Amino acid sequence: GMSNKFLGTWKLVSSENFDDYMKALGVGLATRKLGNLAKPTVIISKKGDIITIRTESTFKNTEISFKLGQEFEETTADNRKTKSIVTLQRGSLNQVQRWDGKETTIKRKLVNGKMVAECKMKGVVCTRIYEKV
Numbered sequence: 158g159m160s161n162k163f164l165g166t167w168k169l170v171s172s173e174n175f176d177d178y179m180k181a182l183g184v185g186l187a188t189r190k191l192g193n194l195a196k197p198t199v200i201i202s203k204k205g206d207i208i209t210i211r212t213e214s215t216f217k218n219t220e221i222s223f224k225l226g227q228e229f230e231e232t233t234a235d236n237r238k239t240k241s242i243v244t245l246q247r248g249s250l251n252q253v254q255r256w257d258g259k260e261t262t263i264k265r266k267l268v269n270g271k272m273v274a275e276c277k278m279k280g281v282v283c284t285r286i287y288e289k290v
């Protein structure tokens with residue numbers, strides 16, 4: 158299952174190309190401006206086989222709970238209603254969100270003890286690096 162090294166609290170320390178990623182998602186300017194300033198914490202926890210990913214920031218909080226391989230309904234931080242799934246691949250915790258004929262992926266992987274989230278929509282790739290705190 159998911160590595161226990163994911164469990165805990167993570168703080169954003171770097172974000173590359175997030176504005177264009179939000180644009181690709183259809184997020185408007187005022188929201189993007191606040192999204193570009195946000196430096197969330199992400200809390201990953203488990204209970205049994207249910208994993209929870211909670212994001213906290215001044216602007217927006219989100220939370221998803223899921224079992225690996227089992228599709229679920231999600232509310233995103235930009236207020237999309239998606240059909241989502243999280244699965245593993247080579248230890249990477251990989252999320253797909255689908256809505257309205259569109260798709261985005263968020264792949265969260267451990268790299269030298271940092272959590273790296275790669276976020277792809279259309280051609281746009283955004284990389285967000287988190288430190289464990």
Ligand SMILES: CCCCCC/C=C\CCCCCCCCCC(=O)O
Binds near residue numbers: 195
């Ligand atoms: C919830 C805090 C970060 C987002 C703040 C701006 C809100 C809405 C715009 C849409 C953002 C959707 C992507 C959220 C980030 C996913 C990748 C990550 O966990 O780093």
